[PDB]
Amino acid sequence: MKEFYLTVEQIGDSIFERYIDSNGRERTREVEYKPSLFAHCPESQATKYFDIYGKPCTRKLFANMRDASQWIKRMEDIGLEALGMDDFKLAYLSDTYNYEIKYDHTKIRVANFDIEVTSPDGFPEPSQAKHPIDAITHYDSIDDRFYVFDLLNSPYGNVEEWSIEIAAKLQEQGGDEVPSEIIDKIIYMPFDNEKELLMEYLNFWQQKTPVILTGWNVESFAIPYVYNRIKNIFGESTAKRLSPHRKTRVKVIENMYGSREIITLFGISVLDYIDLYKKFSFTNQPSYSLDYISEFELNVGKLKYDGPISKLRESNHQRYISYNIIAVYRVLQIDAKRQFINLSLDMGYYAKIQIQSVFSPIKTWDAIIFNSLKEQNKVIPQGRSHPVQPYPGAFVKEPIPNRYKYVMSFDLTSLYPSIIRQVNISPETIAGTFKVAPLHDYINAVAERPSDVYSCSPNGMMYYKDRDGVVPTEITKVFNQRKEHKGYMLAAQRNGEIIKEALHNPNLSVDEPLDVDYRFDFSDEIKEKIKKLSAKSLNEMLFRAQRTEVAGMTAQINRKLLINSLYGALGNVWFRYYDLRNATAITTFGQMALQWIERKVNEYLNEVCGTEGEAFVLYGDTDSIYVSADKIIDKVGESKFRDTNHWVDFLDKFARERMEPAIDRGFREMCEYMNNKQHLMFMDREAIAGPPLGSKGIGGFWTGKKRYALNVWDMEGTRYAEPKLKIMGLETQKSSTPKAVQKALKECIRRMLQEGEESLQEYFKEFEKEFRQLNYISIASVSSANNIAKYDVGGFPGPKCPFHIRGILTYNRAIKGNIDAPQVVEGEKVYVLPLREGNPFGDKCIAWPSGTEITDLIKDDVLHWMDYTVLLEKTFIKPLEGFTSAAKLDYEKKASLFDMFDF
DNA sequence: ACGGTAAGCAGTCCGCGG
DNA sequence: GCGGACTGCTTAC
Ligand SMILES: *P(=O)(O)OC[C@@H]1CC[C@H](n2ccc(N)nc2=O)O1
Ligand SMILES: *O[C@H]1CCO[C@@H]1COP(*)(=O)O
Ligand SMILES: [Ca+2]
Ligand SMILES: [Ca+2]
């Protein structure tokens, strides 16, 4: 096994590094690192080193890191470039590890913890930590154990020991239903006072110190709470022992009337799961409680308990510890599914950065390009300052809102990284500029070729074709990796189901799994000898091809993530390599590209069909276009169309054998027109959509920009046995529209696309009649609640207050007094409802925290003055009206043909 | 501090008004 | 008094 780093930090002139060594042991070393930076120099005095612009550079070596920083400061105050890596950690890692780091994650301590704090007044603020910590569960990946510390005596009660035996037992008999596979894994530890508990915990931490610290909301609550709790009782020095180097920073807080803040524990790497999830789920949640994320991710229910949680330790201690145990486990279950931690680790070791820097695409990419440039003795630019000037982006086809019966979309492959490569965009490849004509003029091939010699973008930028550019080179390196490991992940399943069918063959002679690598596709040398194997080494030949299928997935996905994260880096002013003109160059080119192929598609289908200037491209957004395929269908007619599968075949055959070639011909001209280095605009078909054959369904409708629905039968050649609704943007896609309403509109949209107007009407008629029976939560609205405390004027609202904040502050005024009632948290979400006329509240609406049931004390009331008539019209009818107006349908008989006008 | 474009909504504004 | 414009905040592609 080879060496790799665990964590790294700069403290003064020292780098403090934790690492795994030659033999698998973790260690700490302090290195009084001597860094290098670079300055320009005469031609003559040329070295081995050059900047990316190809300019000769003198290497300066510094006694310490402070001296380096003092030099950058001196060079600034002069006005000369100070080149090289100014994050000396990235330089430390780059020097210490010149090679593909290969981590073994079983050697990395990843801690998973949660704490409980009984608090009879407010939510317990972690910056004051004024209430005792009465339970901690701490799971340790090296040990594979849940370490439970349980306070038995506290100001808020004395309670007997938790029992594991009772905890393992079922729901229906006073048991907790702590799952069977972890029960044998819990190390229970009771305490008669809080100082003893905290002291033992600090000791534990000393000997089992996390490299990677995770959990749920652990960064904004748990870590600062224990830190501050310990600090408040023991002193700063004691609480510093949470850091393996006894250094912490307490970062400048956000105050208005509360008081809250984040602690940095040097030498630990904190990935809060709530943050890994908000980064890597790409699905927006109505609430962000662990409670609500589990029922979503894992399909495990409520975490039941009679009575409020502040009386939970007192009333039911046994379930209290158990729930804190299940809390830790539930993260661990999500990470088994999601593999977010391993993703982060895989990213961070590829880039050679602190694992916690995966939350930054700028730092990840900075590091990747730095390593790549170093290994060729090149020198990175001084990261300069730039004014946050807004450039223009992807303009969007404004669609005629309407029904659209037959639709097939096509998609540009990784548009933006493809553009950088094709045009060869990079700081140092800028060649000059040209007279730019209006964009329509390029899109239309009217303006003259921008250049015979350089590679151009319609914003005016020219680039060298003869170089090939720091940035394009780097993306290309990653694309080819993303295709390398795709042959080692989709080949790790070729090794699985081929050992999965050899499992028929059992055992009669002792064996051990064969020594040939999984990063290759097997042949015939071991073909009849994976058969004559035993059925115990067949189980071990399934540990490994499954552990490349995951690593090959996790690594490649990390490349896909790397590829799409770049543009964001490139357009961001803090990026070493940003350049406004290049960014604009990228977008402006995309926009051209997308409208170019628009005109190319419309030109083509008009010649094929025998027709002049009729629109086929009904919409376009950034990388896709959506073509109306009605006239393609109607050029054969419903007939000799056997069944639904028959016309979809037709459209699949048509796009692949005819359209796609013309698109290709179209983009090649565009390449020649702009004289790009390389043609990389690869547009092939995405979705095929329409109504079931022989039906009254409408297949699709657009409402406006970014708001549409399609009945899809095929996605990239994967034909569905049942049609999939591709709704993009409508209320059923929104986190703020109620659930029961999210359902109804989906069923409405389904009925429109697949069945009659008759069936839409039958359903609308019924959802109305059954509305009052619905669950008050399933029919409540949702919004983020930002700046509550701006419109908050003596309990009431002042000038310009939103609806959602109105609700927040008629709540604040209803619960004024009752402490065991949740107070809306600013930045978090709120569930909203409307109240009617002479209500006992004061204003029109009421909003309470999302995820939750409203305090018992007003829940019964709010189920009397609830405005369902306004709530039905607001959340259901208004949006339905939108769809049907667009689709040219009615949801109700008797509807007038006039209106939809103005007279 | 670690990309633009655009929706739909509820509040208010603005100019034009017996 | 009137209704379209513009603002402010969400949350979408
Ligand atoms: P839509 O009709 O699904 O098309 C999606 C396109 C792709 C780029 C652009 N987009 C989507 C999502 C985010 N977050 N940012 C974007 O620019 O819309
Ligand atoms: O514009 C920002 C937000 C999304 O892309 C960039 C990310 O840069 P940073 O490294 O978070
Ligand atoms: Ca798309
Ligand atoms: Ca594709």
Dump the DSSP string for A47-101: -S-EETT--BEEEEE-SSHHHHHHHHHHHHTTT---BS--SHHHHHHHHHT-S--
Closest CA to A242 of A277, A216, A222, A268: A268
Q: How many CB atoms lie within 10 A of CB A180?
A: 8
Compute the distance between CA of residue A614 and CA of residue A592 in angstroms, rounded to an integer: 21
Closest CA to A329 of A215, A443, A471, A425: A215
Residue with tokens 């239903």: A177
In this structure, which residue's CA is closest to atom 2 in ligand 2? A568
Q: How many CB atoms lie within 10 A of CB A516?
A: 11
DSSP state of A732: G
Strand partners, A683: A412
Contacts for A666 with CB less than 8 Å, ≥ 6 apart? A596, A597, A600, A601, A604
Tally the C-alpha atoms within 13 A of residue A623's C-alpha that lie toward its C-beta: 16
- What 3-state DSSP class applies to A792? strand
Sheet strands (E) in A222-341: 248-250, 263-265, 269-270
Contacts for A838 with CB less than 8 Å, ≥ 6 apart? none
Strand partners, A150: A135, A190
Closest CA to A810 of A793, A787, A827, A828: A793
Contact yes or no for A485/A514 (Cβ under 8 A): no
What's the CATH class of domain A1-106+340-382? alpha beta
Entry resolution in angstroms?
Answer: 2.7
Contact yes or no for A834/A870 (Cβ under 8 A): yes
Six-digit token pair at A299? 């399909």
Closest CA to A185 of A169, A205, A164, A207: A164
Name residues 700-729 of chain A with a Cβ under 7 Å from nucleic strand C. Answer: 706, 728-729
Q: Which helix (H) or strand (E) holds A19?
A: strand A14-20
In this structure, which residue's CA is closest to atom 3 in ligand 1? A728
* A730-781+866-888 CATH choice from 1.25.40.340, 3.90.1150.10, 1.20.1280.300, 2.40.30.30: 1.20.1280.300
Handedness of CA A443, A445, A451, A452 (dihedral sign): positive
Domain boundaries, chain A: 1-106+340-382, 107-339, 383-468+573-729, 469-572, 730-781+866-888, 782-865
Atom of ligand 2 nearest to the CA of A365: 10
Strand partners, A412: A683
Beta strand A378-379 pairing with A50-51: parallel
Contacts for A299 with CB less than 8 Å, ≥ 6 apart? none
With vertex at residue A806, the alpha carbon angle to CA A800 and CA A812, rounded to the nearest 5 degrees, is 130
Measured from the CB, is A695 under 7 Å from any atom of strand B? Answer: no
Contacts for A97 with CB less than 8 Å, ≥ 6 apart? A3, A4, A5, A352
Contacts for A242 with CB less than 8 Å, ≥ 6 apart? A202, A205, A223, A226, A227, A230, A248, A265, A268
A359 CA from centroid of ligand 2 (Å): 9
Superfamily of domain A383-468+573-729: B family DNA polymerase, palm domain (3.90.1600.10)
Compute the distance between CA of residue A229 and CA of residue A104 in angstroms, rounded to an integer: 35
Strand partners, A687: A715
DSSP state of A541: T
In this structure, which residue's CA is closest to atom 11 in ligand 2? A360
Measured from the CB, is A390 under 7 Å from any atom of strand B? Answer: yes
Q: Which helix (H) or strand (E) holds A189?
A: strand A186-191
Contact yes or no for A351/A199 (Cβ under 8 A): no
DSSP state of A670: H
Contacts for A894 with CB less than 8 Å, ≥ 6 apart? none
Handedness of CA A293, A296, A297, A302 (dihedral sign): positive
Compute the distance between CA of residue A394 and CA of residue A22 in angstroms, rounded to an integer: 51
A682 CA from centroid of ligand 4 (Å): 8
Output Rg (C-alpha) for chain A, integer angstroms. Answer: 31
Q: Tell how far CA A731 is from the center of its chain.
A: 21
Six-digit token pair at A385? 């300052």
Measured from the CB, is A736 under 7 Å from any atom of strand C? Answer: yes
Superfamily of domain A782-865: DnaQ-like 3'-5' exonuclease (3.40.1820.10)
Tally the C-alpha atoms within 13 A of residue A889's C-alpha that lie toward its C-beta: 32
Ligand 2 pocket test: which of A279, A572, A586 has the largest number of ligand atoms within 8 Å of its C-beta?
Answer: A572
Compute the distance between CA of residue A734 and CA of residue A878 in angstroms, rounded to an integer: 15
Give me the amino acid identity at A205: W
Closest CA to A577 of A383, A385, A367: A383
DSSP state of A356: G
Superfamily of domain A107-339: Ribonuclease H-like superfamily/Ribonuclease H (3.30.420.10)
Residue with tokens 């608090």: A119
With vertex at residue A628, the alpha carbon angle to CA A627 and CA A630, rounded to the nearest 5 degrees, is 150
Compute the distance between CA of residue A686 and CA of residue A883 in angstroms, rounded to an integer: 24
Strand A186-191: give its sheet, edge to edge. A186-191, A145-151, A135-140, A110-116, A212-214, A269-270
Query: Is A469-572 a domain of CATH 3.30.70.270?
Result: no
Compute the distance between CA of residue A218 and CA of residue A119 in angstroms, rounded to an integer: 18
Beta strand A50-51 pairing with A157-158: unpaired
DSSP state of A363: H
Q: How was this structure determined?
A: X-ray
